[model samples]
Target: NTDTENISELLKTYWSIQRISAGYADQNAASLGLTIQQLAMINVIYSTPGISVADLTKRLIITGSSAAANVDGLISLGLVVKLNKPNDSMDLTLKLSKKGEDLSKRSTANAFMYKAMMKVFENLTENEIEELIRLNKKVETLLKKS
Candidate 1:
């Protein structure tokens, strides 16, 4: 059996990807006059429509005041709107506005950097890609259970 190398490489790769993704979003959002944190908040809201501020705070891993302030800033920027949850006075749901949706689309669509990375990956054969995907899924499954 082959001995495994240090898992630090894997962690480093993951962090690199995260930084690249965040950088891309931050750059695109800046062109549209939004901050990096604002973009992150909007992206999370886009993924989970009608999410409460409490949930957003949890998802963003920020403090309650910070989450509230971020949401407020997004609201002022016309990127997100808060809606009252039906029959739940205590819960408010957040949704992207039309402008927000458009901005989100532009920020993510045809990601040139990601595509460039994919081109490197494309050097691998189809079966190799499939095996890599399988391995990725296995890792995800294990992490989920942990």
Candidate 2:
């Protein structure tokens, strides 16, 4: 069945969100003195401090080389640091630096803006929001199984 009208409406909303998010990412990246990829790596490190590169690859769903490249960029920027475990010379953990922490706090404000935008949906009642959260969890559960 053809539902061009309904599909067009959905596509319009999707494209709007995609475009706005991309613009926000670009502006925030520049403000933080980072590229979008670097910012993504920094965010992951900040959120999951002490995670190893191998773990980060899985968490980020990115290729090993790409993740390593991003980490290298952040390290060069002094936004992230690699720590070596005392007991194991090769064991390393990634964490945010003082500057990275400051940037993270600033980035969190952008995240709040994203939240605010989503909250503007007219049909989203309080109960529906709660239900959406529940459904999101369910979707994640289903994704994990597949």
Candidate 3:
């Protein structure tokens, strides 16, 4: 039988590995003078286009003030813009400035904080990889929707 303790330890280990992966990205993106979290916002806004800081907070799973603070920094650094949607009173949408585009372009040739996972994958065969993916996806989807 699977104990709650086992599940808790598994998740704790998973999160620890996730942080390690982020640390790797932090080191990888260092030449840009940006942390992985900031770069992540740059990433999300670049892809999502027209997303608001409020929505950014949800997507990043951080507090509103934290999102706003990071966006404020980006704005001051001339890498992001906040805009009012035509005739709509919703929160100002976030977009990349021209300089932000430059940063985005330069960042495309990098990793997804995944070497840590890839390292783990080295021990698995193709069949094991598929099973791992399926199980992870099943659990993640369930947790995300719950």
Candidate 4:
């Protein structure tokens, strides 16, 4: 059995580390000529099969305008695809193109971070998620330690 208090703290450590992982991931993305932001989105898209731009923006600490621009670049290079949702034709959903998936997996450790965090966030509140961003932006305690 898990110790309630200890387990909770342990998981917090996990989510934060998972969020902060990008060192080598950045390097691999670079070889493919991707910016860190672009690489981040690729992994995010890779993990979420059909994530919409709205959800994508919410997942990371990025601005809507920039996110749109980044996705446009991804689309231009054929690394990502945006498809119309028949029932909600006005909104587009996202999927990684084969190239995007290929490079994302190349990130290895960094890619696994998203996989880990995606599942962890499944158990967190939106408020909790934001605070995570707040601390992640500052590279706070657990983030620094990780």
Candidate 5:
């Protein structure tokens, strides 16, 4: 019973943190004229530079159609561009435009949001951060197995 109660409390705390992070991300993205989904797409493209729609879908664990829709919106906003390799017009690759690159950095940095989240860990030592990372990974691995 004690173990079950502890597990329940851990899950609740984890979910609460996730929700809080997501809420902040959504609001920050909106302040920059974007949805959190769009910001996420930009971050992926910025990191990978030349990722495919299929790869993006897999990486994001989203449907292909949904990934394509987000890419389309990014293209329309001039934040992303599609290019075809020589003699491979059928397979298009996605890349971030200059504007996209700028926004991607800004979105990832999210100064105010970063500061807010950082405050939560401001007093943690490096060893504490490592421990937290280890525990989080352990929990993630267990969840994946289940």
Candidate 6:
């Protein structure tokens, strides 16, 4: 009973921290005239240039329509572009435009949430950081299995 209570408290605190972090990120995204989902989609596209919409939906674990809508929004903003392959006229690939690439770089470097995380982990040693990451992955795997 005691162990369960301790674990419960730890999880609640962790979840609260996650919520707070996400709120900060959402606010930051809004300041840039973007939705959180849009920012996330941009990040994915920036990281994986020329990814197909279907692949993006799989990566984001979203429905096809949702992925298309998000991509459409980005396209309207001129932040994303669709590329056609020479042989594959039917399939299209997604890539960030120059403006989108610049925004993605700035967003990653200048986000308040990233800065806060940097400060939070500044004092931790490399080994400690690795262990923390490993522990988190283990917990995630256990949760998924259950």
Let me know the TM-score candidate 1 reaches against the reference structure: 0.62
Q: Alpha-carbon error at 92 in model 3, in Å?
A: 8.0
lDDT: worst 10-residue window of model 4: 83-92
For lDDT, candidate 2 versus 4, the one ahead is 4
Steric clash count of candidate 1 = 0
Candidate 6, residues 12-128: lDDT per residue as tens digits? 999999888887777687767888778888999999998888788888888877888778788889998888632222245888999898877766664888778798799899999
Q: For candidate 2, lDDT tens digit of each residue in 83-135?
A: 86321222457899999988877875776456656766566888888887797
lDDT of 3 by residue, 5-123 (tens): 88998889999867776567666779677877888899899998899777888999978777888888888898987775321223769789988988777676545445556777898
Q: What Cα-based lDDT does every candidate model obtain?
A: 0.77, 0.75, 0.79, 0.76, 0.80, 0.81
TM-score of 2: 0.60
lDDT of 1 by residue, 45-90 (tens): 9999988887888888888787777777788788887785232222
Candidates 3 and 6 compared: the better one by TM-score is 6
**Which residue pairs collide in model 6, if any?**
none
Q: Across residues 20-113, which tens digit of lDDT does each residue of candidate 4 receive?
A: 6655456556777888888889989998978888778778777877777888888889998877532222255889989888887776555545
Best by lDDT: 6
> Of the candidates numbered 1 and 3, which has the greater TM-score value?
1
Candidate 2 Cα errors over 4 Å, as ranges: 1-11, 85-91, 111-146
Work out the TM-score per prediction: 0.62, 0.60, 0.57, 0.55, 0.65, 0.65
C-alpha lDDT (0 to 100) for residue 126 of candidate 6? 90
What TM-score should be assigned to candidate 4?
0.55
